[PDB]
Amino acid sequence: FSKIKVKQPVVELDGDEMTRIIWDKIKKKLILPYLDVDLKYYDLSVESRDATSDKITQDAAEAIKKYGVGIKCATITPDEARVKEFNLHKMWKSPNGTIRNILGGTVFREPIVIPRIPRLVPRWEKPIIIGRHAHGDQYKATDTLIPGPGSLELVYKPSDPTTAQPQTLKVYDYKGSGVAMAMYNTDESIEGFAHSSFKLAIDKKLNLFLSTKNTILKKYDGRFKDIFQEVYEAQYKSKFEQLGIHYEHRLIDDMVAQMIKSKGGFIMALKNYDGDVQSDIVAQGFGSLGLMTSILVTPDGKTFESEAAHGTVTRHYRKYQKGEETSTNSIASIFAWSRGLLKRGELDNTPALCKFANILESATLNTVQQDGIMTKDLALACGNNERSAYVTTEEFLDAVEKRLQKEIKS
Template sequence: MILVKGKVVECVGDEMMAIIWEKIKYKLILPYVDFGKNLEVFDLTLENRVIYGDEIVLDAAKAIKEAGVGIKCATITPDEKKCEEIGKVLRSPNHIIREYLGGIILREPVICENIPKIIKSWVNPIYIARHAYAGNKDVHEMCIEGKGQLKLSFVDEISGVQTEKIIAEETKDGVIGATFIEEYAIRAFARGSMEFAVEKCLPLFLSTKSTILKNYDGLYQRVFQEVYENEFKSRFEERGIFYNFILIDAMVAKAMKSKGGFVWAMKNYDGDVQSDFVSQGFGSLGLTSSYLMTDDKKVIQTEACHGTVKNHFKKYLRGEPTSTNPIASIFAWTKALAHRGQLDKNEELVKFTEIVEKVCIATIESGCMTKDLAAALKNNEFESMTENDYLTTFEFLDKIAQNLRSCMILPKMNI
């Protein structure tokens, strides 16, 4: 057994991914890894959040920051209708954790040679560096009823001077949204993105729409350029890489025509949208690893980049077979444990995570896969697929577990 020397925080989630999460833990992790008393579990199921509110999520975030490592299963963010049903307004667990930890969200494609890319020209990975909070994901909203004047105002704490900007002289019956981010947070985002580009030895692009949001997006553009010129330019040039700013609409077109092989930094919501585009372009949302990293690299919180797969959960509850891709959740475990191993200089743990990832890829490349990947081999012609073309959720996990056993040179276990 491989001993885990430092604390790991596990966040349990909802629906189909929660079912898969437990299978991953007991089939692929616990037969080989001994956490001892170093695994702290937080129940972030919707049922538990209804009881304890968002405070339980904040407690998990604090524990992750203290431990330096967090692993999170996909969770439900209740919409307005669901909040009315449960009698409580609950925020997105992801947003609460990201807001507390700060940093950047990094998304990497898991490339399997036999899974065809939708965007054929992408021969090299594209890494998304997404700001962890603010932007459209952190908008403060207010409904406007009646007729009146709209304005933004800021009161200086020391001088008491108030600065105002009129949004509309005369308006009625609508909605207003406002967001704010401090410059230090953008500077930390810039440093984190550039450190990652240096680590990967790849060029870095920042994309915003600074021609429209001249102050908000313009601040991102200015700060990134300053950090690059003052702190990273020589390190980039030593490695033969570069940093460029490109407007986001132009960058989307450039990315589609490219061969890949770069890091793409974006604000929170932009990164959310484009990371799905990139993941699908490489073959599947299920073949993507996602983790939040603080700018000092001391804390990593991993997760699957997709939701709870509600439609598959309904089938599961009816006793029907499902074929849900677990790779993103498996890589959530491996990326987190790899960081724990690096923090503790635990080479055995790091090596184990590398083996698990290689086994997952080799299993898919051997032809054993879930329905979403099998469909990609048939140009997504689902109507022509039969049950012989793919494995069910649990058959696929069993196959990975079987292949992992043969790689670990351990006695076979009843798992």
């Protein structure tokens, strides 16, 4: 059929295991037949990474920065058993972290809602998006064991004693053995977090809430609150008002409670640790990870990386490897493509592309909603594990493919 010309190159990052499998199928059956796009391919499989000494990972990030918009497949984050499983030169760092830090920007997780599929928190009918500040609180902290009595201090010595002054803060006086830890964060990173959060809220046309425990951590957390407020008043307030959306700081205690009581439909910006823990809570609350997507947004709002929020689905890959039946959800991976192409269409002002992206999504979701064709993970939420309620990994892709063709005739 007629192909849509994609003006700017799209960066594609291949992953491994199960997702690598459905990725190739999604491409040939759902993308390549309708678009004339130039894909800058970067293989991020563990095998490819271990070979290039993890260089392709960096090269891929650079590519995304250069062209704007990357579309990524889940990848394996090597650990102990992984190093032996593939005979790696060493436990490489998670490609997700390496790319995220190279591009700057923040990651926002968004669940896809399908009416027909109940949520564990049934009241949730609209997505609750979680943005996580992944810079350096507890994830870059220094912790140790205090052996016995003594004093603990936080000491800061400025590189320039003329403008700033030294700090020597008393933390605690141990009367026995125990534990200690110190962490940091910077104005620069927090500022990017704010910018990335406001731009996504504008794009999504959703209310934005920042959560901290500023009542306790008066300075530390207070810092996040002040920078968001400052960045807001100066560059986004007027834009939030035109759309009818609002920004607001809320105590993590209140936000968290108001969150599970709501019906959803808004964005929560959170600090490293809260974002980590709350993302797992929200995802599970909506249901299957097969419906959790994610988008990386930079402060300048010119660079994006699109990828499913779940992993390589290793357990399903073990079955696949033996020829055993699998029911893996391809929905999130498909949306990695549609959301990435959508951004591609927006930056190049190519409505044609944007239109196709919304059609791919519609075809995908109506397959479940209207036709009732779905994978096991989805059927489980309905209370139907009978091998007649769900369909196989490939059967689902076949269904959406057929549906796309139909909905594409206009």
